[PDB]
Paper text:
By using three-dimensional (3D) reconstruction with icosahedral symmetry, we determined cryo-EM structures of GNNV VLPs at pH 8.0, 6.5, and 5.0, as well as virions at pH 6.5 and 5.0, with overall resolutions in the range of 2.82–4.36 Å. Our cryo-EM results show the protrusions on GNNV adopt erect/loose configuration at pH 8.0 and 6.5 but become prone/compact at pH 5.0. Notably, the diameter of the GNNV particle under acidic conditions (pH 5.0) was smaller (370 Å) than under weakly alkaline (pH 8.0) or neutral (pH 6.5) conditions (380 Å). Thus, our cryo-EM imaging has revealed that GNNV structures are pH-responsive for the first time, with protrusions on GNNV adopting an erect position under weakly alkaline and neutral conditions but a prone position under acidic conditions. By mimicking those conditions encountered en route of host cell entry via the endocytic pathway, we discovered that the protrusions on the GNNV capsid adopts an erect/rising position with loose configuration at the docking condition (pH 8.0) and early endosome condition (pH 6.5), but compact and rest on the capsid shell at the late endosome condition (pH 5.0).
Nervous necrosis virus (NNV), a simple nonenveloped virus in the genus of betanodavirus, infects fish and damages aquaculture worldwide. The structure of GNNV VLP unveils GNNV capsid is a T = 3 icosahedral particle with a diameter of ∼35 nm and delineates the CP as consisting of three domains: an N-terminal arm, a shell domain (S-domain), and a protrusion domain (P-domain). The S-domain comprises an eight-stranded β-sheet to form a canonical “jelly-roll” structure as the building unit of virus capsid; three P-domains from contiguous CPs in one asymmetric unit are located outside of the capsid, presenting a protrusion at the quasi-3-fold axis.
Author numbering:
A (entry chain B), D (entry chain B), E (entry chain A), F (entry chain A): 52 to 215
B (entry chain C), C (entry chain C): 35 to 215
The structure:
């Protein structure tokens, strides 16, 4: 077997949220999980054709004063083609969390473990396991710098160099 | 205890909804009427793509689940006409949702296809994929539907024919969500 | 066999659909924002009648069932605001769906009512009818809903308050049908 | 072994019989069983040189009103070179059936199991196992659309592309 | 069972490269491997619904004089969607070969034995195992009649009948 | 484990040698084997800190007419620092080959499987396994398009991320 197991921590997305703009339902983070976003996996997927996600956890680590107001809801939609970004969709899914802006939380979602494709294509269900969505729950009193780390572990295969 | 700057949140049972439900039923996927003389050979009577939306009770249950897998799928062709009607029918289930071929040979090639007279009711026990399929629509139909059902006329019928295609199904829904088409 | 005048029908599995499904979840029945100063005493923050339509995932499952019975029903009041907000709230669940009284006494009288500060989250474990209730709407609300939830302010709040009322429910649907509102 | 076992249902021949033309001995169906007639086996024999029939049943499925008059006799002559189409030849053979026009019957004949040739040739005994013959027994009062399905099962060999 | 193992060789593409036009990077051959491309598999796929490529190899057999100064690079990209006509992209793929214009070579690539579909659809990744690309390396001196052959061994399934 | 075995072929260098310039001792190719030189290993080393070359071979594939009178000598010096462009120095190294300009050959050298560093530094002996040298033997007659390929199999370690 020529499968290469690669794993590690990496920050998929960082967002800045100025004070007073975090209204309810505001989409702070909306990231379709593909290996291109992941820093270390971006180079590994550039040299392979297919990958299979073996572990995926999203650690939301926001950095705001403890007296800041408002909260956030984070979830992982297993369907990359789904284009719904609301509290209802997040609360429906498994692994979703809701917490105050100064709390760091962990999202352990339900993701497909089949063999996906690193490259882009017409069918998004064949390239990504899902979409991470992080929304505001209430108005934030202070500016929030939110960073979403992602502990991943994939199994690459089929060596081939690829272009952006 | 003390009075902190901000107390920790205590939302406990979030993202722990029900994950798997088994749903069963038997619904009419098609109903057709043929006035005398239109049942020419090869005329397509029923062309129904098996999707959760086609099944009414499953249509709502598929709106709260991401992926479903078909466990049981059997079709019934019930022609409600007397035993003095000429001509006949051929019914089949193409496992490929994208296969749009409407001929006698294409139907007869599939496993479980039936050929009968217009006064004989039949049951199609087809070949379908047990793999998990996506409830919501996508770019490729082969990831969302187990197949297609085709019902054709074989001979020129003599009288008006009423034909009902029923489908006994049983699916297993997984990966909870809330689809908003 | 012989050739009769008309052959007998052979529809076998008709009217034998699934009868009972247990459905569970936890959904936000209400969400309110109070700018500073509007939290006057007795001001009604949340007034939600517990019906299957109010619960999103149950709304679709109730459209294919006639009667449902509530097995578990517990509400959570989550105020997402700091620990320096004045005033407080009272939350209760009136078992009578038609009881439209919004006062502190009416809420506190009910079993399981909670009184807390705006920086304390609470859980209401109320008294609800275990009897079978009709999914579809009718002339009398007491045959279709287990009760009503009321959340009121107790004191004048100092800061803007975000309050979310979540409801952990568990129902048993019976008597299959297809409701078309 | 590179033998490919292929089997399936397929309609060899459909015939329309107008009312009043089905006199006694009329040859409704006269089909020399070669893989070209069989729809799915037509494509399989186009890519192979030799085949051996392992199972052969002919299901006659006529579609006429139940009050129609007259009957049909169906048989399978094991000799493709034989050019006799009468009730005598059919009744002599094994597996022959006789039935009213509205009855569907099954013919389980006696066929050679040797290795035949898909392509045509001078000797017809080396290419086909036999000839299906379906005749009218009496005058038919109504128009009859008769279809002869064939449950077959062959064992192909010797890969080679072929032309009509 | 419905599984029918088939194998054989077939010329997927043939190209004629006149003298002087074989500049570096020129795309001599770009052929997406589909069942219709292979003659014997073209008929096999017309009578089945699914196929899985168990074995796949290619042979480049250029037919040029021994005084033809030039070279070619050949490789099987295991992703039908990927489109990159560069030397490094081909050489990255496993089994890719580089040779002179008067030397026949064999490509033994890597690919996933996933159960593909014999009929075309919106997504090419479900109907094709990949695509063979043959490029020029250096300017050729004489006319080259290149003929890429493919030795395949596939496993058909789900009996049906189709029209292209 | 952090160890990730990778392997593949990549063209380390390509040179064009015009007619008459291939005098004896001329240095056609002098390429220091570094991870950046190999495309697929270039991305693999950008996401790791250490690598050890488990297997390393080279193939010389000159592309010249069969009437090209001349010869080449190829060899892998296992010391990056050593700098000697002489025939005897190359032939001394294990696996060195001598051939005609129209004959592809394979170099299977000797080297130490020491855990090298993927990023450049002051000492080249810690970042490169060696250097391949290809010299002329005798004056060539026609233009030669030489392309040295390298088949490598390395073992990465110490996960990290780097920029070149
Ligand atoms: Ca790709
Ligand atoms: Ca969906
Ligand atoms: Ca009702
Ligand atoms: Ca032949
Ligand atoms: Ca198809
Ligand atoms: Ca470094």
């Amino acid at each position: 077997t020529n499968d290469v197991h690669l794993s590690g921590m990496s920050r998929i997305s960082q967002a800045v949220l100025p004070a007073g703009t975090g209204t309810d339902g505001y989409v702070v983070v909306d990231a379709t999980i593909v290996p291109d976003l992941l820093p270390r996996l971006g180079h590994a997927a550039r040299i392979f054709q297919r990958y299979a996600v073996e572990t995926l956890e999203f650690e939301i680590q926001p950095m705001c004063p403890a007296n800041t107001g408002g909260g956030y809801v984070a979830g992982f939609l297993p369907d990359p083609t789904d284009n719904d970004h609301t509290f209802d969709a997040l609360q429906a899914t498994r692994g979703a969390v809701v917490a105050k802006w100064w709390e760091s939380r962990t999202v352990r979602p339900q993701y497909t473990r089949t063999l996906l494709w690193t490259s882009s294509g017409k069918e998004q269900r064949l390239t990504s396991p899902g979409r991470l969505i992080l929304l505001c729950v209430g108005n934030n009193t202070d500016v929030v710098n939110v960073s979403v780390l992602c502990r991943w572990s994939v199994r690459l295969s089929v060596p081939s160099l690829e272009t952006p």
